[PDB]
Amino acid sequence: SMSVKKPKRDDSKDLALCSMILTEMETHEDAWPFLLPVNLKLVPGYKKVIKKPMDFSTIREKLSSGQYPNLETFALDVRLVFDNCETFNEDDSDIGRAGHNMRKYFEKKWTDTFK
Ligand SMILES: Nc1nc2ccc(Cl)cc2s1
Ligand SMILES: Nc1nc2ccc(Cl)cc2s1
Structure with missing residues (x-):
């Protein structure tokens, strides 16, 4: 609250790290x-x-x-890609499978990098 803050998490590298993660998404063969x-x-x-x-x-x-x-707003857009994919594509299609694979791939990179 006012004049009461949690210890400040270092966020100066976040822009760069998100760019790296996105690069790895872009170069995945199921991208x-x-x-x-x-x-x-x-x-x-x-x-x-x-x-x-x-x-x-x-x-x-x-x-x-x-x-x-x-x-977090970055991760929401990434997840939106795969939520959209799930909404429009059958699980049992190449695109349906691509989406599940990519989401898994992302969520691990995410956890390893920030959590
Ligand atoms: N991410 C993507 N979603 C769709 C949904 C339908 C079709 Cl035809 C292609 C694509 S590519
Ligand atoms: N951006 C993309 N749009 C489409 C639409 C149809 C198919 Cl089969 C693949 C793709 S990739």
Whole structure:
């Protein structure tokens, strides 16, 4: 509360560390369904069903332009990619499987780096 703070966690490296994690996502061989925005004109239903589209290149652009206030807002966008994927894709598809794999991959890098 006012004049009462927890000890200050060092957050000066967070921007750089998030960039590294994102680089490792981008270079994963199962990254291909998530590298660019889903084409809202060539995929029937996507625009209407998925209210908040997100993809790695958009995350990269937001990261590089100071649009994430903190660590956590970055992780929310990453998770949004895989939540969107689960909403639109059957678990038993290549894209469905890519999503589960990538989420797992992310959550480990996340835990190892910050938790
Ligand atoms: N991340 C992605 N989600 C979808 C959903 C449908 C189709 Cl056709 C492609 C893709 S790529
Ligand atoms: N950004 C991407 N959009 C699509 C849409 C359809 C298929 Cl099959 C793959 C991809 S990757």
